[PDB]
């Protein structure tokens, strides 16, 4: 898992997100969708977004960004003790949303990108390391639930 020091770094980085949850959430989803257009197709409510301009102008995309990062933030604040928070998310994403674990990898990478993009020079190597570990733990615990369900895609 993560050390106490690493968790402190994660939650310190997260303070950046919490100052503008909607903006971070929007940029994370836009990074995901533009980098990996197939991911948009999992969202019936975002499929109509034909351009990045349309994505940026979508209030509902911003809203969903807030939902996503709020959920992730609740999980991170548990510092690994997140079974109750994570299980339902893993299960909805496998069974209802049909989200391959690959897409969770994509969004994890998108979060790292967005943190650097929004805070260039202020997302240090230690912070990137700690946040990466936290996102890997998140993804890996989801992956375990996916295997339980026999879910691939
Ligand atoms: C940081 C990782 C993610 C978090 C924390 C997250 C969180 C959430 C939450 C809280 C919801 C609403 C409740 C629910 O249905 O369980 C949701 C819905 C959904 N998620 Fe995710 N999600 C993540 C990654 C992804 C990815 C990578 C995709 C697709 C590429 C995805 C696809 C969806 C879809 C299609 C819905 C239903 C949206 C709707 O039409 O309302 N999620 N997600």
Swiss-Prot record:
List of residues that carry Phosphoserine: 3
Keyword rRNA-binding belongs to the record: no
SUPFAM superfamilies in the record: Globin-like
Binding site for nitrite: 64
CDD domains tied to this protein: Mb (cd08926)
Record-linked PROSITE patterns: GLOBIN
Entry GO CC: sarcoplasm
Chief subcellular location: cytoplasm
InterPro entries: Globin, Globin-like_sf, Myoglobin
Locations listed in the record: Cytoplasm, Sarcoplasm
Domain Globin residue range list: 1-147
GO BP: oxygen transport; removal of superoxide radicals
Enzyme class: oxidoreductase
Protein residues bound to heme b: 93
Binding site for O2: 64
Record's catalysed reaction(s): Fe(III)-heme b-[protein] + nitric oxide + H2O = Fe(II)-heme b-[protein] + nitrite + 2 H(+); H2O2 + AH2 = A + 2 H2O
Keywords, comma-separated and alphabetical: Cytoplasm, Heme, Iron, Metal-binding, Muscle protein, Oxidoreductase, Oxygen transport, Phosphoprotein, Transport
Family as reported in the entry's similarity comment: Belongs to the globin family.
Subunit structure: Monomeric.
Name of protein: Myoglobin
């Amino acid at each position: 898992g993560l050390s106490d020091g690493e968790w402190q770094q994660v939650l310190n980085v997260w303070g950046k997100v919490e100052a503008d949850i909607a903006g971070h959430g929007q940029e994370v989803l836009i990074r995901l969708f533009t980098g990996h257009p197939e991911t948009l197709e999992k969202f019936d409510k975002f499929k109509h977004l034909k351009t990045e301009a349309e994505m940026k102008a979508s209030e509902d995309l911003k809203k969903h960004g807030t939902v996503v990062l709020t959920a992730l933030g609740g999980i991170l604040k548990k510092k690994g003790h997140h079974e109750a928070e994570l299980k339902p998310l893993a299960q909805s994403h496998a069974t209802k949303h049909k989200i391959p674990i690959k897409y969770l990898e994509f969004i994890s990478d998108a979060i790292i990108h967005v943190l650097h993009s929004k805070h260039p020079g202020d997302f240090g190597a230690d912070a990137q390391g700690a946040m990466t570990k936290a996102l890997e733990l998140f993804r890996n615990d989801i992956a375990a639930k996916y295997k339980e369900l026999g879910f691939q895609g």
